[model samples]
Target: KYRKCEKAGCTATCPVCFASASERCAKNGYTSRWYHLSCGEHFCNECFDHYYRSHKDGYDKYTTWKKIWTSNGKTEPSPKAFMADQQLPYWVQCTKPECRKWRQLTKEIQLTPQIAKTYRCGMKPNTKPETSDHCSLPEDLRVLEVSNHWWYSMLILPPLLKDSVAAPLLSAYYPDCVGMSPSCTSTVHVPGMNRYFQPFYQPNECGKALCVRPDVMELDELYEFPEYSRDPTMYLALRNLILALWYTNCKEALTPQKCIPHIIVRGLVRIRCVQEVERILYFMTRKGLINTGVLSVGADQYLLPKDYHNKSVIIIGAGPAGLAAARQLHNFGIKVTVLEAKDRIGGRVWDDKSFKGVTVGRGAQIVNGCINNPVALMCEQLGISMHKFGERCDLIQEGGRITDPTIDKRMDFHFNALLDVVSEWRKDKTQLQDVPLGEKIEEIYKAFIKESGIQFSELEGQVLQFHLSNLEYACGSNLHQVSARSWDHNEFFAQFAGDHTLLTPGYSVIIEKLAEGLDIQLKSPVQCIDYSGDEVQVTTTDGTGYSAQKVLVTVPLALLQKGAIQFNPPLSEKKMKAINSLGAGIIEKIALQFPYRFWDSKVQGADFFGHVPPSASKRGLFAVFYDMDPQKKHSVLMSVIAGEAVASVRTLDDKQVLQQCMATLRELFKEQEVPDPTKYFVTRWSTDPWIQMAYSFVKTGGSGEAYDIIAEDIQGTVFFAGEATNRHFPQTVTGAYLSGVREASKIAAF
Candidate 1:
């Protein structure tokens, strides 16, 4: 009889077997009711037994496999027997009798970390099939074991064998390699390897190759033989590699092609190596590594005057221009003597540390467009730092700072744009040549206001004027005085990507660097130069006479204008006119060192400009002030007075100049009480007899013809070099040095 269930809503049917009623279908044993171990569900005993009977092996294994074979959670083991009866996964390399292959254990057979430690491909090992052992290896990989080492042996061994005496000398220097096996061919014994053997005629033995030092040499000639001739391609490759090696070793670059002729003359079998030498150099240069790889074309190489022998040069001034010429001349093995008026190397590049014991360049301040400038390169080589100026500029007037930043930004944009426009105008030869730069600027600004619809207020005009005057100061002349046609006619452009930067530790360091290895006679100012004979004679102010085959006059335009040094054969009228036609600009600086920085936090600029009243005719009257502390280490201020303003600044005494600077400072910083300077310094270039002027500029209505004329030598006897002689980069330290190198190269070829 069927009995009713005690629990409410309890079903009598078995969930797995689908039975309606039975004593065996009471409840699951594994669970609360009869549960099936295999099916993961509550079931009657009848259905659970039926499923377990079919899948008993899977169920038993899942439950007891960990106990039967435990790995101890190890991913891989190298033939390790955990227990006496138990074993773990391990690896074995094939060294079996006939079947040489890899295998893994039956317990470990899956692609995992467990398998990775013991598994390799189950295939036969790769064999060379009795072919050449060396040739079977990849060409690139074969060199790793042999080629370069053999070449090194071939290059070094032949020289010692050719010259037995050289062996002792080499042994003393390179004791380790002299008697060693790999270094000496006698000790190095390689059978059936003909390529490893040393050669009969190396380049060093026959003078086919010229090495600045013995270490960097090539053995291409030595490898040449009738059986296995030195490849033409290999010879050319060795030539350039040797060139670069020589330069890297000795700091001197030599022409690689020059060795080709020597190699041909030395009985090298492959004369075809000379055919593509020039073309190979051209291709090598396009690789961006071999453009200036040759000696004469590369940095500062003047190899002993070839055409003109027994010719000596006497450079009159020991300034940058004169020193550069002398250095080049001396490098060419020519006799050169530099006569410096002052008892120092640098002439106008004077550093004034008298104010606060800090080096401040009084003459050449900024290294304008540093790239391609020899002075800049020297500074880099000497480890001198160059600091770029901050873009922040403050404009102050009558004890109050101009709060509007838009004015400064606008002024800078327009000023630089104006200069760019003038540069474009200068490029056009037919454009306004007779007009003054001031007139051009006035015209451009008026047109700009009308066309661009950017109107300037009365206050903005004063700010604009202040910035314009600063531009004039950079040109070293007033806008009206500089020529419109040639004011921006210099060939040099800023190769670097930012504003002009100044050299720290002073520009005099470059002067000192250029003066190295040069014979300079200081305190020997020349009084007269007589180029009337074959050998030019120079008489110093101290009654000392000197003679040389040629003379280079590198004095300033002011000195030449004053006729400080008398020339026996008077300079041509055209040359004199050129010297007089170019204007010598005047600019002065008043450096004031304060005890403390009052405006340190208030101002954030390397430089600032003070605005003058609109009514004042003199524009740049102490308008520009440079902060001596770029890194904020000191509290020094430098006032730059240019153009007409320099006239007033030069007239004032030191005390008066200090008071003027302080008054301007107080006006700018109204919140703080400006104190008197602890130290003050001022430049007197105009008053100084030696310099007499600050720099040079192109006068109105004058072109660069004067500079070109002066650069030419006078009948191959007297050569002129100065800032004025550089048409492309006139009135710069770079220009002065370039002029010197130019004159030196010309004299070298004479």
Candidate 2:
């Protein structure tokens, strides 16, 4: 029930988060984007100018060959460098005001054709599965193939100038493109169909309408700071327009003026053909298109414009929600793209080469609901394996000897009661209210101890702490910051009844398998989305662009909020408002690998009292000897940290974290002289520029219905899908996969 602003081009709730902002977008949630609902896609200051000008500062500083060779001329730095801190945090702040940019949903306007002229056609199946769907259009539409075969071909786009000779025109217009190859040119001589390449009648023609490749002219252009490609969004929009026009009637189209959206896609190309195909009619009123004074291109009259549609989505982060959305899109064949700001996927399930030779998924190790968990199902399909926490070791440790040998089931009991308590507590609250759950529980404990025979030292008391630790361990956020209502709402959601299965071949390997044969442009990051024109224009960091009938954006919610990329004409108010409401939780992981399992042979009487020094901090507390194996013995120990405190851990260097972990491990197992770690790795999701945070969390009083609002379809062309986008299973890998697949199916259905 939070009121959203109605201003245009103003910071708005994330389009994906939409109506959920007030209920779910808490201050510290991974999706703390706040603004209007419609304006989710937007461009940053740097990308805005980079798409329109030929300046240097607008682009990120890149090195040259000399810099790489003789430390003088260096090649352009990789986009990965954007994750580096220096001017990072400040740059990530939303220029949009009151709202954090990192949480804003991207308003990037990638090209997507809404209605294609139904081709009652098909190409004979080729040996290549990808070629099975290939088709050709008129010479005027040949350029559309670039976006069509985005993952298949390497196409580059350079800006067109007002006036210049065709050859030299190539250089001035596309410096970065020309740099790729000295002899590259943009000549396209098609036997039939349209031409995006240089015309066949060009002065430099080699007789063929389409040249063997783009000339050095396309590669030589050097982009301004932060930008690698030229007008990737616009370029993609144009490409998609061409393809959609062809798809619509298998010919060119003349769009009407009235149909153009006032917000995005102002510079759309004009088409002449208007006919009835399938259930969609091509006839449009004269006022369908828009005529923005700035760009000469006109907007389209169609309800779902062909060129400006954003359907093929790319997810930047691969945390719980990110992964959930990605997997869903992948299953749906929506051409989903994922950009992991970190080197590896699995935002918080990180393991390093440290503790006696164990694989530690620090943040989420135990399978919360193992029996029917989707991840477990996937493990079964992939033939991977895992260990049950109950099956692995005894629960309690007391005295200088092995303890009571009792397993802790009291947590289940306390949580059931706590869930009931939380439900009653939330009856009086409405909007999201953040508070500490640990404090509430402590108060509950005091009351319970007095009212009932439940002593403080009894199992029930410890179960309360276990529930708190589980919340901290699973969610990586403080109990106080958690929404009591949101927590209780998840109680009868669905029981996780699957076995905890570990990936023997590595979980990252599963990502590679999932990504196999998929069409994608590696190393290509988006820059801006210009929806002000007729067609949705999408520009990439490398200046390359691709178009589609629609774009399915799969980037993490955090990166969308960063406003690293900008959108022209802005997004809706509800969408923008949601951006500020949801919060990205802070969770970090530290993993250490050791050569041998030291605890396997611990003497019978030694009580390995894990030490916690006063000044060390909770993050320094290492839960010891959770599991042991004498055979094939190598152990890796991982530490989990979350909440506002995670900020402190994210700031530490990897080596520094490793050293502290080693010290703690040595104290835990003093009987054996622990050898120095042979190998080590640490993943701090908070420190990752692309990821920003791990997953989505609901604050106190946050509403479950908000996910449905956030994931709603906008104007039929824009649709949302992600773990956060899904309310049923918000923070799991299976959730992402299922959501991604469903989104793709929806696109196909539409």
Candidate 3:
């Protein structure tokens, strides 16, 4: 028979099957006759103390509970809301060190923004540049746009003209007409005046059966019957596209009613944007078919010495900066062509299939801090949803122990003192200087740690530094890389406020949306930019060139360093100096997933503080284990490596990495056997050729003035942008986005 516990008000039913009985006996003191597990061992008459201590495995209890819950799972309710509504003044405390105070969700609340949602090729609204004022560019450059419908549906070729008054070199390539088989019922329109051209050329509408050039006779005068009988629609469409561009660029007249609908005919034919258009224009100019000097248009006469009202521009790099410049020119009615390296839109944002379950944002991730951040405001204006990530930090002290917050008062004291030391040393508020943050902190710490009587060993000090270094992920660069002078000058919303947000659909969504309704070229990489001559000559890798009054370069810093592209008439000294000074920091993430929550033992796994060797053979400097047990979820742990650790870890073999992780877990759990990980994943930012580093960082004593030098465009032609170029919020996703927008505004206003 089962026995009732002696403790007053005890209702535990045998701690087994809820059997009710009353029996009294004492084998291990004044206890009960009932025994719980297979041992039938005796214990005191306490309530929970009657549990099986012989096994001490702690696995059976958790395993059984998981099975029961999974088998009879129900729709979960809101955990946070329910707890908030409970009027009961709850004071239930758990003695387990690991789980204590960490409330197991009575119910899961709103799901946080998972990494999986930020995939590439996501859609967006406000497809156009939402703002007018972004970056400043040369005013002489005007841009016009044509869509696929304009060419395919209307069936015409674009006349690549360099000058408004000159004849243009035109290409007559119509997919629909070319694809038509010889036996097709559709009749091809004849070019010149005759019964063949009568169908398209209405005498009532044009007062002429055939259109001819004034300087030269119609093609019929120079060719035979069948050869002269070309399509009339193609000629009309080509003339319209060319004339519209001439009126806007060469004539400095942008009348939407007169120029828009005709320039953009059909709305079905493909429109080659900045890159493609530029190539054609350059070819025509080289062939002396068009005079681009007549195409210049400028709002500010002084800023632009020579105008390019009738010239065509070739923009290389379809990145944010390139797209921004193109949109600006198009809005102003100038002819622009864009050359892109990647096959699709969103330059570096390719879907990395290597990371299976999660969305691996290979290039960009978070939009940095919100609240006054330009990108955040843009997202809000565009109605793009952002997930807030602020309350996810795990700050601990006491040799990496999960001690009670109340008891860890010493940690707060030490941190505050350390911060005070930093404040005192780097007291320059004028935002002018070049000093690295690491050196400054080291100097400050050295002076105070001895006199302050903090009682922290060298190792403890390093641990504190490690905690502070977590800021690298937020900045997209490491603390060591960022300069103290620059960091102090630029305000990244301070450490106290503003939420770090990421887009649900992806970072590229906004860019792709912005690209909507614009003429652009995909997969055309620009190889060379020769601004040596009067007009900017931009050549693509495919041997195509385009000329423009001005050209905007928007390649990444690393690419520039590697000389992936060549620039003629080398950049000015000021631009070169600033480019040389900008910094990129190292950071990487290593993610691992396991089948079960294995580690949580009282001795080791429970809030383990790893005593990692001074030299661990891994990219990550430290490791932390998360036991997803009580939560009943598949276990996942991440090793966040930065700076030196990032370099070391990236060199490890997959098997070596796996083994190291297992070994680390073993050490933390104090167990000889390690559980096999079901899945392993890692991201190597350094290894990525496109993006060599995570983000920008401040160099020692490097100030904001240095950034201003880079940000200043030379003659409003050479524009610089990126996180590092931003003056206000350096080294953040928002910073980079805002920088792009800022550059766009400049060109648009021009």
Candidate 4:
């Protein structure tokens, strides 16, 4: 971390380029204090004027951050005399987060004048900066990014360049050149290009190509040789990727004609953007030549960043979202540190291999939608097997008698119809405003029996209760506390399609894959984030501090709501409102391993079965049991406790809950031998200190916009992503995965 100078308010080095600086320099330089803007930024004069002088069009006005444009409507720099006569070159690359490479021809464009030298890199080569190479003895050479600590991904690297970290494994498959063989060409450092990116022209007599980094580089120059040519598709792809970034989720459009000549980034820079990674890969994954199979086998359909250079990022939590983001950021060659509060990685997605030879998932096991699901695709890519959870489920009453199929199906249909009407109410604001989904279903269900000539049976009543309890399970809270208006709001977004599938070997297998080559600090719970200045300071519970240019928070929403971590300068009102609006939902699991499968005859190898509670109050207690071993290899039955039932069970001792579970098991096999559980595991995600609850849900008067709000980044400094922040697929593993990719993409973009 950069320290404050002995002289008050000044820094030991320039914030822009890490050059030596002090109070005297601040006097001669552009001061940190931007009066009306109040954006205190430190920079040496040369770095400030060279990189930031163009961003001063409307610095005096209190207008929004989109007031820049080219002088005289020119894309390139004009004549020296006319340029000064017309005005300054406001046509430079944007410092605004939205427009990373967004160059415009409009009368006015955007940003708060960038005092932090964010606009220099893409400038015309000669006009950019004077570099002291091996050619001359440059004075005052100091190293910040070159230092070992500055390489945040040191441990995460392929390993040395200071962390002088790896190209062996990477270079083994992916050579940055023609067809196949490994390019052993030594990286020839270009004295002219002192910058890390494109530092080497062509390595020692190898085929003509510019190296992005050691072996990951393959993009070539020189239009002469068609034999060595990979064609020019990458140019359009890069241009298209830039255009795609200018349009946000709230907006989408085609690639524009105007584009920036350069991409401003490489301390191993990061484009921490969800959109940045996904779309860029989509456009760049070409049809031939440029698509060398090496990097293909190397990245497993993923692309390492060609432009990824300098930048620092710290992600809180090593859950799916955190790891997914960390994985890509690492692939991009950026320094990404993952600080997980727990002793291990994988937040809610956990696996227990000790349960009688079965790889039982203690946390999330099922892929909500197998087709097009990111998790499913990854598993497929890795040769992981998945068992599609069965459709049929049996119901056993207190007497262990199987409920008639006709009656069970009756409530299933009725329950589905009830949900549809409730969802239909969401179309207009006039009806069921913040009304409890539980209350509305009960209100409608009571009318179903009264109007029909069918006599009300106790079995149907209990079965109806089962459906309500199941809905509560989905919401992660008792329906009475959840908003009917917004409970099904996520349904509006196109969700991943197809049947849910459970992994066989365990989610840990997948977790292990994503966790490879990552810099994860386990047992380090971040206590506070002090973003009161230019660089962000993250302090852990142990008082250890790590600084980064950007911080991505992937902690579960429950923690944020509980104020577990402190935020200096505080989070915005909108963010807090969004946090408060969402409710923390809990779902506990109990997996029992028995000597024999007692319910097999009745369940008939069904994936799962539900029990008819004796009364409405017991609806969620051991509500459903999933057959962990679909093939019946191991006698493992996992039960899920949902809604208020979780609170009730938490109050009960282990003996109490197990005794209750056994009582229902006996009822399913009445008058037959029911073996006692050989082993049992219970998961109380609710009480787990590291992760307080299952996932986030919308409470009464809560809006789906809460998800959107919490997802918004606080400046380009702090970003957030997780199941809670994903509006499209909250309360699911894929939701977390997609959100993590998004946060990574967002952070990378910044």
TM-score of each model, paired residue for residue? 0.60, 0.50, 0.50, 0.62
lDDT (0-100) at residue 652 of candidate 4?
81
Each candidate's number of clashing pairs is 10, 229, 62, 44
Residue lDDT tens for model 2, 1-750:
322323343433422222221222322223222222122222232322332234544233322321232231122322212111011111011112232112111223221121111111131111112432222221212123212323112212222211112223233223233222111233122222221222212334343311222232233122211132433322322222222232222112334221121112111011101111111222111111111001112123222345323346655445444454444444333445555444455555554323443444544544444443444434444455654433433322222233233324555576657656756766676674434465666566567668898654443344344445546545556666666656544444543443443343344444544544434454556666554444455677767654434444545556666776565556566665554444566666655556655555653322222222222134223433333222234454445555444655556787877776676666545555877877666676665666566776665545666556666655544556665666666655555544554454455455
Q: Superposing every Cα of model 4 onto the true structure, what RMSD results? A: 19.9
Residue 116, candidate 3: Cα error in Å is: 48
Model 3 agreement with the true structure over 12-59: per-residue lDDT tens digits: 334322111113324333343432311111133232222223233433
Best by TM-score: 4
Which tens-of-lDDT digit does each residue in 1-750 have in candidate 1? Answer: 123222333332333322212334443222234431111112344433332333433234222433322322111211111110121122222222333232332432322222223223342232122322322322222122222323222221111111121232233233112211112221111111211111112223332111122232234233322211322223333333333332232223334333332221100111222333443443222221222211133235444424444688899888788887876666556789999887777777887766554578778768765433455445544556766676666676655756477877787688778777776666665433567788888888888899999887766777777878876787777788888787765534322222367666777877776677778999999999999987899999989999998999999888998999999899999889888877887787878888987666667544544654343355776786777756677877787777677777767887887787777777777766777888878788888777787788878777677788878799999999988898867888777877887787678665
**Model 3 TM-score, 2 decimals:** 0.50
lDDT of 4 by residue, 625-666 (tens): 999997787899999888888988878877778887888888
Say what the RMSD of model 1 is.
Answer: 26.9
For lDDT, candidate 1 versus 3, the one ahead is 1
